Structure 1
Amino acid sequence: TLTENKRKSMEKLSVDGVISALAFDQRGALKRMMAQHQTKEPTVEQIEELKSLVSEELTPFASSILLDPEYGLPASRVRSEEAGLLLAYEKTGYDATTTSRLPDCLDVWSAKRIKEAGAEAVKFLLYYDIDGDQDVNEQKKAYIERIGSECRAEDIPFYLEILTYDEKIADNASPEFAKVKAHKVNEAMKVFSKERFGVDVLKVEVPVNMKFVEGFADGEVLFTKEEAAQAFRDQEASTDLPYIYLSAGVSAKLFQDTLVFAAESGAKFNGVLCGRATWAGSVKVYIEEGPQAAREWLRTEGFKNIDELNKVLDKTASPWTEK
């Protein structure tokens, strides 16, 4: 039961109950990508400019765009008139030195300032290991409670992104992690669907690593199609909140086929916040060839990525205007 203002904001972020959002709040990760292609340190100006190019060129094809408030405010002002705005609230990355990956809001931001910056939603990323240290998870749960309350007070939708991991498993791309991924994703969704966290939409991973699923796997096969399908149904049974998928930087084609698979399996997902799968290739072009060359990439390859995604969404996603 959304308040009047939260519903209006949700409408601004969606079309006919489906969220077809573009994600570009990447910061540290984006800077590292740019650094691969030039000698000099990527500048604040370059980061701000690439974000503006992506926003201006691709938001006409998205129901909304997620940006960070650190570099993305200029980009937010050139988004399509029909597209809504989400702003990220978390500091970028995490400490690889430890296993706790504790959440931390941007130092000079608050839900109120995010709303004042023109956002229709506050987005926050939490790393979560359901099987992790209980005191660490207690601190994480308390942190999300605070943000949930902020968003209730400011009357702005709270989008919580959850990225799972295992304290003892170094690489989430490994077969070892793939075997526990469904558990990590689905149980974390169940926790954060509790009323006390104030979440309006969950941004989550697919509960399987498709690279290990029969029909998609090019190497070791860990799961039959029926086993993978059951993980999607388990995900659907973990929450009654709206939820949308992140791409995790797989290829545009794989993400598309994954959504088709999710839908056939019985996942009633409500759209996507898709970032890297759409715009990844623009970074090299921007750095090596400049702004105009990036625009031309975005109008051809970038458009192809988001256009094919939109066609898939049209035949796979379920409207949140039912829940």
Structure 2
Amino acid sequence: HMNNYTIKDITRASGGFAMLAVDQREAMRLMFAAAGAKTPVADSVLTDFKVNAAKILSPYASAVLLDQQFCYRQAVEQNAVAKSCAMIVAADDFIPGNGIPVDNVVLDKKINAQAVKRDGAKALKLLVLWRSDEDAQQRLNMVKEFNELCHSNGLLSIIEPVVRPPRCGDKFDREQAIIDAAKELGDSGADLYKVEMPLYGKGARSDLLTASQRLNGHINMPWVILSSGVDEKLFPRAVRVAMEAGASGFLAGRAVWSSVIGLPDTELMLRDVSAPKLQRLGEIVDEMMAKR
């Protein structure tokens, strides 16, 4: 008999999600180059930063998201993940194209779900790129195969729809695309929906709330906000507003650790600069869960 993990296994005791992403791959290599690291940036620079981020920040997170390419095995072998923090393993295969590192994404066929479970993983995660002029059924079929990979192995399924401009045309409304992706994928049988924040978290709180309530109405599973595209200083308000609209927390990377890339004394910087940001987000999640 299979004892599946449950969403409670990746939440704070409150039931809110306060989750850390360090699974960025070639996108993280480009961030090191942009911050002034010697090029070419060696794989070990990414591995060392990811494992240090997990070691120093995972005590503040209900779950951490790791990639097999650069850090899952290293984090497990080095006991970097706090025992209070669940492990999520990326199961997406990023395909570069058109001058960006993630132009297409397919399910990573190399992942051994039983083996990552034996190492302590509770969940897998799949980025789904959404475009108005690409076939919805191909996206749904990938999410169905992913759900089956997770559920047949007693793991949770986390999907992350991310909107992109159409392959052809200049008819792109990012705010409508986020809604349309949720109309398509918001009831797709995953355990958790990781979504972009409306309006990049910018502008009047009341307008962010209206936009977040509109999104909530199309998601029939628990949902959390991601930080890509949101200034680190606006992300705490984004979490408060999204949770007022019905979200259950956050799964964030850049808004926690991007600002320390290129500084001296990386471990001190992760403790003094990144950790207080992640701690505050956790406190906001508990405050919002207490109001239900």
TM-score range, shorter chain: 0.7 to 0.9
Distance 1:122 1:230, change over 3 A: same
Residue number among 162, 179, 186 corresponding to 1:186 in the alignment: 179
Say yes or no: does 1:252 pair with 2:232: yes
Alignment partner of 2:110: what SS? coil
Q: What is the DSSP-based 3-state SS (H/G/I as helix, E as strand, rest coil) of the residue aligned with 1:41?
A: coil
Q: Which residue of 2 aligns with 1:297?
A: 269
8 Å contact 1:103–1:143 — kept in the other structure? no
Tell me the SS of whatever aligns to 1:250.
Answer: coil
For residue 278 of structure 1, what is the aligned residue in structure 2? 256
Amino acid at match of 2:179: N
Q: Does 1:307 align with 2:279?
A: yes
Residue identity in the other structure for 2:107: C
3-state DSSP class of the match of 1:6? Answer: coil
| Alpha-carbon spacing, 1:190–1:117, altered in 2? closer, same or farther (3 Å) | farther
Shift of 1:168: 5.6
| Cross-structure match for 1:221 | none
The 8 Å contact of residues 94 and 105 in structure 2, kept in 1 or not, is answered as no
For 1:69-93, what per-residue CA distance to the aligned partner results, in whole angstroms no more than 9, with x for missing partners? Answer: 1111212431111110000011235
Matches within 5 A, 1:1-323: 4-7=3-6, 10-15=7-12, 16-36=14-34, 37-73=36-72, 74-76=74-76, 77-92=79-94, 94-96=96-98, 101-129=103-131, 131-134=132-135, 137-167=136-166, 177=172, 180-194=173-187, 197-211=188-202, 213=203, 215=204, 226-263=206-243, 266-285=244-263, 289=264, 293-317=265-289
Distance 1:19 1:30, change over 3 A: same
How far off is 1:249 after superposition? 4.7
**SS of residue paired to 1:199:** coil
Shift of 1:64: 1.1
Partners of 2:40 and 2:15 in 1: CA distance: 42
List per-residue Cα deviations over 1:98-133 (Å, max 9, x = no partner).
9x944323352243443244310010101012x223
In structure 2, relative to structure 1, the CA distance for the partners of 1:61 and 1:138 (3 Å cut) is same
TM-score by length of 1: 0.80
Cα distance, 1:169 vs structure 2: 8.4
Give the deviation of 1:245 after TM superposition: 0.5
Q: Measure the CA separation in 2 of the matches of 1:26 and 1:296.
A: 22
2:9 maps to amino acid: K
Q: TM-score, normalised by structure 2?
A: 0.87
Bigger drift between 43-52 and 246-255 goes to 246-255
The amino acid of 1:315's aligned partner reads: E
SS of equivalent residue, structure 2 residue 21: strand
Task: Tell me how far 1:31 sits from its aligned partner.
Answer: 0.7
Residue 109 and residue 181 in structure 1: after superposition, are their counterparts in 2 closer, same or farther (change >3 A)? Answer: same
Q: Percent identity?
A: 22
**1: CA distance, partners of 2:81 / 2:277:** 18
Q: Secondary structure at the match of 1:126?
A: strand
* CA contact 2:200–2:230 (8 Å) conserved in 1: no
Distance 1:97 1:252, change over 3 A: closer
Mark the runs of 5 or more structure 2 residues left unpaired by the alignment: none
